[PDB]
Symmetry: D2
Subunit: 260 residues, 4 copies
């Protein structure tokens, strides 16, 4: 059971992928600092992680506020003593509309949470890892960043930005024994947020998907070679691999988790 | 002269690549709407363009203001009647510092001008191109967005965003006879933008470049297979190719202009 | 009308893309050396080119035979004096079958004609260009090389090899004022090639396409954002662009011609 | 210990990466079927594997001979009963020379061993895996296939072919619960295969490296962000990740193991 004595700051920890990844890292003996802007979801997640029997604490923090991020990371360093791993995962999906009708205020919001916020967290945590001369970081990008999808102007651009940020961060931090990589999930389901993407692409009425949500879900699944959307639980193991020693000579890489 | 009869809106038109491209398109016959936030630069550029024998006009506009962009685009349409081509090129280079010390305010600034501003222009202009059922767009990305460079966290992420946005826009706009592509210049020189980069990279003291500017320019040119930086004038032709009919079945692509 | 005085060796010249491209280069004043193994196709192609009014000669040659290629290039050099351009285009589509039943002999044949054969030509011709300290080369790859398609194991591998060979050759030949690039056409129609692709994909019965050829054609067209296959006449201008001076700082690049 | 009861066929099992990978898989409880053309290296390699306390057997076989490949695979299924995992790794490094001087016989030999032979193995084994409706495959590509390197025309081309072939095979075999992925090692040292690369690049005297072998080695390490070549033992864990359940929703992907 590796990761014993390791500490991981998970952002967006109250959400689907963040909670699922925290549990896996915990099951592995990792101590977890949960960070999310959503208090209710945060505490519900903290409870599920505590059972795993590892040390764990929560921090309500809006990553777009750098002052709140810096204070929170400092409280984390104070509460756990160090931050070995970072799963820089908080994010917002954005509206769905073709570019000519894309809500402009929403576009800046997507960039601010997904890029600037992810950067606030990476910067503050990286300074700490530098003092430790050790650290492994995984940034959550997306297949939308690998190839811009229809009606997702903002999100796609935010995730493509994350992929480049990951490469630049990998180069800057390499000298301090820190590695930085990214994961790019494709269609993940079910539950919800899969339903959001299905309903909202359907509502657009572009040539890319039907306006019938049941039909859209089939077109999306139908595009995956494995012919299923992925289960949220198929992501934590990729994260763990990128944080652990088997990826020791890997940095600056982006792993599609998309069924082909 | 192809392009005879066409109208191209060029943003960042008072700057290096923007002016060079405007001139080349004017030599081919296209009327030019120049857009830049720098009035002094615009005016010198507008006079050079008119020397080529086409109609040319200037619009002082900060692309970060959507209200200014929409106002300007409307005036461009009132003055020229249409907008056939768009060279979405205004940009800011950003600071040079490793990620752990990257100025946070600058980070948001780079993203707002390079991604949100670029998006404001793309949205307003594509609305007009849809009305025409005709449009060709070229977004200026960068080799920095193709692979994130050291000490350029914000700039590389902004151009990685432009590459994905170009893909999404291409998908969204294909049904209306609009194509959307990008160019990704590598090391281009001489001049102070080339000098700013040599100088500011040298200043960081990172492992990637010497602290001596003469050695940094050597290291940069020495990383290019053609062993020379590119001339700014080796960009206009590429933009013209992506706007004209020789690229009629290409959209959503990104062209490296980098020497190998 | 540039290319006056230029000499272009086109392989696969009797073929569709080859003849289309030779005509366009002839229209720009370039003299054409036509190379193909198919004599009937060649003579009809040559007649079409001469009609353009430029110097032209045909060479029956099987590119898989290095000795035939060497002797042929020597003859083109005596007959025209030099070889400024090369469109390394001859190719074979291969069988269509899922990998577990892909015909092994055919697999080897696809690699020999599409890779080894293109390499024989590229080597022989680059020697002449180094002697002239000038040359521009375009290799015909394919979207199947950019992303391996279903049931096309050999063809995809052959074009993915062409994309790498193009990058190495660009590096190797850079010091001699030689540029080497590639084009990657996607779906092209109508005609024999298109009919074959559709028909043979339908016959496989794989999950990727309908078993009814009428539907398979619609599915292929349907996968394209521009919602049409491309016309081979949308390829010559791209080759011409990669050969001429507007691409002067571009080498080692691969241009998708795929509709999105 | 996952993989208890698993059987993995490893080709090039007498070589560095193949032996290192089989040992790691044996430590996880995997029975190894070692395949190579060199009997003596197989003997030593199998000796090392046995010592991990798992069932292991060796097979002398030239992957370029399809008849030998099918016969060997049948024997493996007879001796172990099934083939759950495949590490398709045998390969030949090729000559080192600028394309214009690349030895043509060697060019073909490289393709035949690295592509056709890997294909022979992939085909025969996928047929078995289809029978089980279960299989995980890892093909060894290389960073040379990700971007064509100077003086390695044949090798880069063969590895670019492997990456495309990996994508096609992932599509073809996905319906039978089989996944196919690749790894792309960068600079791996020390040893004599690394020394061979260093010595032969130095020998070419191209502009890409020093002519002094000692300096070449430093230039290669210096191009790595992590500033060190990777250890061969930093590859096994990646292959194991790609064969195990943590990569359950990943197929058609290529993982660089290159230091940045
Ligand atoms: N679900 C998918 O299919 C999918 C695919 C690709 C990428 N992703 C990405 O994975 C990550 C996690 O996504 P999910 O699937 O877990 O969704 P999710 O909504 O359940 O979780 C995202 C979490 O981040 C939090 N968050 C949002 N804005 C924040 C802010 N300003 N400060 C702090 N926390 C904030 C939310 O409150 C939420 O708990 C995101 O980056 C998302 O874009 C998801
Ligand atoms: N020079 C290079 O080597 C290089 C390499 C890769 C990409 N680029 C990109 O090419 C484009 C043109 O760059 P350059 O080389 O021409 O530099 P430049 O500074 O000369 O021109 C950029 C121009 O955009 C304008 N601009 C900046 N912010 C603006 C705003 N908010 N609103 C309106 N105009 C604004 C500036 O006033 C300037 O005239 C940029 O997007 C740049 O990032 C340049
Ligand atoms: N047509 C398409 O849809 C398409 C799509 C992607 C890539 N391509 C590639 O474009 C190129 C030309 O395609 P096409 O559409 O023109 O096909 P085509 O069949 O019309 O012509 C190919 C030509 O090459 C010649 N040729 C084949 N083997 C040869 C050999 N050993 N020696 C000399 N000549 C030989 C043929 O005789 C023929 O004249 C090929 O490399 C092909 O794979 C075509
Ligand atoms: N060493 C590196 O730095 C590096 C980097 C990228 C990719 N690779 C690739 O990784 C794989 C492993 O290579 P290595 O590093 O282990 O070198 P290696 O020489 O130690 O092992 C290659 C093994 O394959 C065998 N082989 C060669 N031709 C064969 C044939 N026709 N039939 C059966 N077996 C054959 C060899 O005899 C040898 O045992 C190769 O595909 C190689 O090209 C290696
Ligand atoms: Mg990108
Ligand atoms: Mg015909
Ligand atoms: Mg490739």
């Amino acid at each position: 059971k590796k990761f014993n004595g390791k500490v991981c700051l998970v952002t967006g920890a109250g959400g689907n992928i963040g909670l699922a990844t925290a549990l896996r890292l915990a099951e592995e003996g990792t101590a977890i600092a949960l960070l999310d802007m959503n208090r209710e979801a945060l505490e519900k997640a903290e409870a599920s992680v505590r059972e795993k029997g590892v040390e764990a604490r929560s921090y309500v923090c809006d990553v777009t506020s750098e002052e709140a991020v810096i204070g929170t990371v400092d409280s984390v360093v104070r509460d756990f003593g160090k931050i070995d791993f970072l799963f820089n995962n908080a994010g917002y999906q954005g509206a769905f509309a073709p570019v000519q009708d894309y809500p402009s205020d929403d576009f800046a919001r997507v960039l601010t949470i997904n890029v600037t916020g992810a950067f606030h967290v990476l910067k503050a945590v990286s300074r700490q890892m530098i003092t430790q001369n050790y650290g492994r970081i995984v940034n959550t990008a997306s297949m939308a960043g690998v190839k811009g999808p229809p009606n997702m102007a903002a999100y796609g651009t935010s995730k493509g930005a994350i992929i480049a940020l990951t490469e630049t961060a990998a180069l800057d931090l390499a000298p301090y024994n820190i590695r930085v990589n990214a994961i790019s999930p494709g269609y993940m389901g079910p539950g919800f947020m899969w339903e959001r993407q299905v309903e909202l692409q359907a509502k657009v009425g572009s040539q890319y998907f039907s306006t019938d949500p049941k039909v859209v879900a089939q077109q999306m699944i139908g595009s995956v070679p494995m012919r299923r959307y992925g289960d949220i639980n198929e992501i934590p193991g990729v994260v763990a691999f990128l944080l652990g020693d088997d990826s020791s000579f890997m940095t600056g890489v982006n792993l599609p988790i998309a069924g082909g």
